[PDB]
Amino acid sequence: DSLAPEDGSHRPAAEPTPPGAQPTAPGSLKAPDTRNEKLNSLEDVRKGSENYALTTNQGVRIADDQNSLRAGSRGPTLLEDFILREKITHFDHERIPERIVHARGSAAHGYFQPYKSLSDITKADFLSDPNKITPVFVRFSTVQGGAGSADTVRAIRGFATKFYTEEGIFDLVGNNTPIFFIQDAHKFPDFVHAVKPEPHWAIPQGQSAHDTFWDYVSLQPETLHNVMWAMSDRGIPRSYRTMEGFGIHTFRLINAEGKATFVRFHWKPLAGKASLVWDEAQKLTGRDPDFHRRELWEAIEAGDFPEYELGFQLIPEEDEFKFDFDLLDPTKLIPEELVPVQRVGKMVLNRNPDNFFAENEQAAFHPGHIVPGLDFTNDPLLQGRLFSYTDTQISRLGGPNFHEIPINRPTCPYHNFQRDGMHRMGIDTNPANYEPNSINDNWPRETPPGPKRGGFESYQERVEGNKVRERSPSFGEYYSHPRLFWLSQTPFEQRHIVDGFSFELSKVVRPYIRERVVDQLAHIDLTLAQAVAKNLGIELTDDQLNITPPPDVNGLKKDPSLSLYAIPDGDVKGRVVAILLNDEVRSADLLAILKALKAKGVHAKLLYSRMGEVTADDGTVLPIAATFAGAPSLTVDAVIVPCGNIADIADNGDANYYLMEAYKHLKPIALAGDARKFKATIKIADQGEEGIVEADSADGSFMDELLTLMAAHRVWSRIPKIDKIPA
Amino acid sequence: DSLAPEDGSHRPAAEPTPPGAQPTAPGSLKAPDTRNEKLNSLEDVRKGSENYALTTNQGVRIADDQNSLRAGSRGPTLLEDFILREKITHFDHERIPERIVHARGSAAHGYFQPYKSLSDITKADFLSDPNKITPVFVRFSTVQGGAGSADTVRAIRGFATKFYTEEGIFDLVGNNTPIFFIQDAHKFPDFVHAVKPEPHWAIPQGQSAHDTFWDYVSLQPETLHNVMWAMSDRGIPRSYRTMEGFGIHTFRLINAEGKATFVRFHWKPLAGKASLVWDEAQKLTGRDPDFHRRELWEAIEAGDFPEYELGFQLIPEEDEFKFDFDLLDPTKLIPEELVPVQRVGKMVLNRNPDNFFAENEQAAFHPGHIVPGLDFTNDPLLQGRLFSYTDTQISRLGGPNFHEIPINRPTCPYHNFQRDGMHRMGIDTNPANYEPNSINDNWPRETPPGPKRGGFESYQERVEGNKVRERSPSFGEYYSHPRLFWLSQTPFEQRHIVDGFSFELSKVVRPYIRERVVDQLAHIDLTLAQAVAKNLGIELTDDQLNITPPPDVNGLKKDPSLSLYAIPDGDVKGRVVAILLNDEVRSADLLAILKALKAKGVHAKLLYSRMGEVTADDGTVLPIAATFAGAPSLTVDAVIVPCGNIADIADNGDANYYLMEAYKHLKPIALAGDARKFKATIKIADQGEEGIVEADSADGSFMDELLTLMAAHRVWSRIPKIDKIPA
Amino acid sequence: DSLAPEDGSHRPAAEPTPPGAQPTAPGSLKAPDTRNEKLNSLEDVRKGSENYALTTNQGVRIADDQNSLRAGSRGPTLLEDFILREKITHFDHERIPERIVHARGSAAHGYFQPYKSLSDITKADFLSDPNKITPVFVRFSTVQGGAGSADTVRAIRGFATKFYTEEGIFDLVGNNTPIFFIQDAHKFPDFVHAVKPEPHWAIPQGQSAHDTFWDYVSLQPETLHNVMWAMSDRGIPRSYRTMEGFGIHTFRLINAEGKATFVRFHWKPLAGKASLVWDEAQKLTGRDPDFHRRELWEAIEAGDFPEYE
């Protein structure tokens, strides 16, 4: 019609902009100049809209898209309206089956680059040269919930990366914890069914806080290690950018000389590790179920590209049996204290998709999609995975041609004798559809293995034993890893774990299941067990109190790399601050606050009791981002309150409650001049308290003190103080 | 490698060659320079093969494509063989559901052009200028059989044209007879179930000759008009090049002024009309089930392009009710004597597909795919068709995005708010997915209907009546068109129809059904009825002999345009002759023979009792294409026997049968010199017989006779003599 | 209505009758006293029709099944004609993808019984006792052609038997020749693409007589053994009743003591071995493309039950 505003305000700028500054938009409109090979190769399917006639799928233009065709303007709809029928028909068939697991996820385009050639240890083309850039598509996710469940639930997160190499797609389909729950793939449906919503009533969505999960866990002690990790703050990450990623399984690197090295893949978050606290995460699933998704998208639109360092734990073939645990057991981790992570490369995510359904929804990642230079191992969990991803995608994606769906296509050439199938796009001209053939001179042809561009040959591992359905006795050890994890945690981390098991176990209706988990915890650590028992009104028996603790892991009593916070890796860029306005802000405070934040790449959100504008003491007009209720403290990392007419919000329940929720969830809080009248709301001494920045104005050290607090993430020392506080 | 022959004889020349002279090939390899807009736009999806590596669909080069991965070379196959599984999965999912009806069909690419601008009568853009060339994709088919059934069955044939216009796809989905079997789409499942394979045991394939087909016919006399056509030689075409096409229904043309004109669409074969004879057709279903498909492919490879003229029967809106049948009645034809066909354009089929599955199996035609300039009518069968083709495509082609399947894609722009669906290819960047929207300035936008490039608007036909499930009383007349068709046939076409009914009803097991059908014939024509009753050994009753024939149609007692043969229109270009060889052929007969065939564009096939070669009297080495049994007379249009050493083949029972068969099927036979010894095998008098060319040698006179006869197609005066030929 | 004839000649006698004497019928109307455990458990899904009202699939009775709902009897069909849309919808979605290979086939119900207990060599319950009868379902087929292809082509024939045993279904999926064309499963798509219709034009239907098949055969000498059989009269059986059947592979028999015995499975036609001649066979693809399916259906209807040892 010509419905946009004449000021062109309906359209976000094609330049990096801070979160909330502009309406968010499709990747290619938001950042047209951010390219990569894969992004360029999708131009054949991108479709514009501006200046084009509205049409049917057959290209016939539509005159009236507001009405069905009827016999009289008040008459019956006619079957002949083919415009209405194609339109409703496409609408009626929009949905596809969501992923069996990892239905909820958020994705983005990016690129990867190795620091140096790894040719000595792997002939994988994407790792052979530091100037070799490989496009990537990454999808982060939760395990249990459907596609419409919440982001900040407690859960293990999925971390899958599609590498569009020159010698094939390589998918690294990992999680954000270094182990999995089960050992053998045959039990996946059992474990997954136990964690998913119970079969009679489909409750609860996106949560393990229910009977079947803990029932399973309590009868399968192999699960404890990963359960420890999910029960910790690892299970509620601050963002997909602030968690670690792992392949979990031991795989093989094969070099040109044919030598196999055992490898465990890792991703290190260059923004560091940071997690929410439980009450915040649970509230955030309600106030904004799309928090991670939104944050990922906005970090990319703001230029805060999520960056990760690919790392490798490398173990020589000769050291296979040198640990107390089996290298092929997925419920066991390789302590970095024993086997360090070697820095391999950097992955940068710098552009959102155009259409979520087309790119994110249909992305198909598979762990068996490896390339020459990599190989598998006999890890029994991995072994079954190679069966499952290929299988599930014939029904999710409607057929065997899911590789022709734009996001999934190789950027490298692909030729073979495979034909037909639903949705076939490629029109093969080869006179032959079989080999060996003479009619096309046998093309395309097999290709011998070699140092570069050769065919895929599996490493000749010796295989020996009888056909058996048997767990390896080396896998029958379930408690030392959980114990190692436990002892590597800070005290406040240990308390949060205790609190996760406690909350969780309290949602289990059948008491005996709770007791059974407590007994299992007593096999790991008595202090953990007791603390959780106590929260559940359970007493340990004299026998539980004497269970002998599991042995150290290869002599290790703790590995600080297992903690989120024991070793400071804080990084403020991309974090966000809430600024609580009033109707006459000391503009001097605001300029100081704002400039200091921007200097460190920390965003702000101007908040108030209504939308619109307020005018500072000097006449500066301040645009309001959202209300105290509309953009709660759960969505920010810190809260700053500038002086002015504090009496304007001093008695505002929402303004006060904002501070209480923020204080409760250990976020740094800064009160300027009269804003200190809010000290009484959170019971802050006259003298002060670590974690609360206060001054007569937002000058001098005020923002630096506040920014040092943001660097340590949360004010852990405040925990005991929050114990009470009614919020 | 190098498996191909060093001589390069595995590869067909990329130049037009006669049927059987080269191996057939994918169209773009056979005629890389035959181009059209649609063909060039499929180049984004065409895939080569020569000089490429064999890879997985993920682009991973395969080293060994001869073996699965196993533990030991006599060991068990390993689940980690992702290369085997990908290849077997794709293979396992190759098939899609064939079309419910018209499953068996053959298709080629071509182009269309009008003879002149038709803007006085229609604003359809493809009809607006003689220089507007429109790419087409045509699919010819049978109705009843599966995708695997025979081409030369007795059946109605489909003739479907997809026009890729600049204002959208228009699909003209017609058949080879001017009417359909039934009146209301509600009975289509009933009719179709009656003719398809009976349900208990799924017999018979591709045949109407069974109990349920004739039970339905006998109880639903609206079907008799299409049945008369099916039982004539119209039901057994020589080729898809030599049959007519019809849209069947009355549609509308809409001009720039908005005046509506009633039109019935027609395809006139420029090769002319020709059909087989029942016994030849039926025997051809066993010797070459792919006969028509082959014939179409090879006509195109030889440069014998199937050409059809598009014709319109135009009726003014005011003459809606001037006939004695209802224009909306699909079981009624508009006699060309009443309303002549206006020659409007020509379609040329000039290129085979590259991959049958990709382009022919997945093509989706729909009668409802119309463009501004055309509209529907209330024809109750067409109204139901508008619903079905859209609906069936969702399962056949797996989703609502079948228009993104390359062969189906419009070549003109297409933009709307439709999103998702299984296998979405298009990646929409539009910020909006709804209209009206302000966020993308309401684009894509509606376009008012107009003279050119306008949006679609239905002709504003007045609708008046009550909501009723009721047949219009004007449709209740079932014998006059059938009779009109019967009186318009030559005496031998009449005879073939009688034999078509007799043979078919002879296969109906319940004798009461045959009697009921015969009662129906008595209402059409008593001569027809008795001749059919006589072969079933049924006696017409007194009452049935007095049934008063139906009235003429608008005073017509016959219309020659309804006969295949009444008016000479045959063309020899593209036909084929079998040349029966001997071990010492008179090389001067071959020379005169081949020179004249070549002058008319008639093809030849050199047959012998073994493959290899034979040497003429002169020393010319003559390559043999096939043996006598290998390329039966059924596959050729005429048989010529050159002189030489006739003793070599004069006792060959296959050679004798070759002539007995040709003879029985009314085919021209020419005997040179001593070849005249074969006359005793087909009991031809010493003085000769019309239909048989004989002479001392194969000079110019003899070949001119053979070519005159061939242009008359078959030797209809021979019918009476074949009775006494055991063949 | 009074649509059936008064003399009742539209209904086939529900007793054994020779080929062509009556119209053929669904097994349970033709032979209602024949039964087995598998036929009895299908009873819950079998649907009749005599004396019932014609309805939609939601159970609504239909008054007029001859017409669409329109605005005037010469008017446009309305979108609210839900009876027409359900019927056309069902019609529209009747087909499912044919079998990748062995799409052309004919089956029948029956029963199996061991001569004596084989518990010394196998603990398989269906062979544990001579009184133990196992209901079977058997589908015979060709390999190459589609579901609408001809029966008497030159082909290897499939012989699949589904054993509804008391300790699970056992499917014995074999062919009428003792070997297969190829050695490793990895080459299956290769071989099958070569035998199937060439990809450019989708010719020829149900025939190995074309270039790609022979190209393959010539480059893969391991195929020669099954080609030899296919080129013989084994490739054109007179009927499914006169062909042998083999499981092809070596499988194992496992007894209660845990002992393994190698085993090759065989089916012997109690009607003896018999085949057509090539010319007859190919002409029969033309005159009656459903000859084997019809012959099997009629043998059973006549009481000439196909028997296999």
Next chain:
Amino acid sequence: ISRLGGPNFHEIPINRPTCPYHNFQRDGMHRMGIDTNPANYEPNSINDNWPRETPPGPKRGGFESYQERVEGNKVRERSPSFG
């Protein structure tokens, strides 16, 4: 048809009618119902046209649409009264 994979969604247990349902529709993906009727079309003589149509009537009658009068031109238009 896509959500429930075919036209036999009425045979999925929760969706089935508890009253009689008999017609001539056959096949489709996941067909449960094994039809024994010799005929799969009507009118048919071989099953004496069963199952049969049933006239509209007060109870147990076939569906017949109310005969509403329809008068207007074929238009894509919003009634002015909905404005």
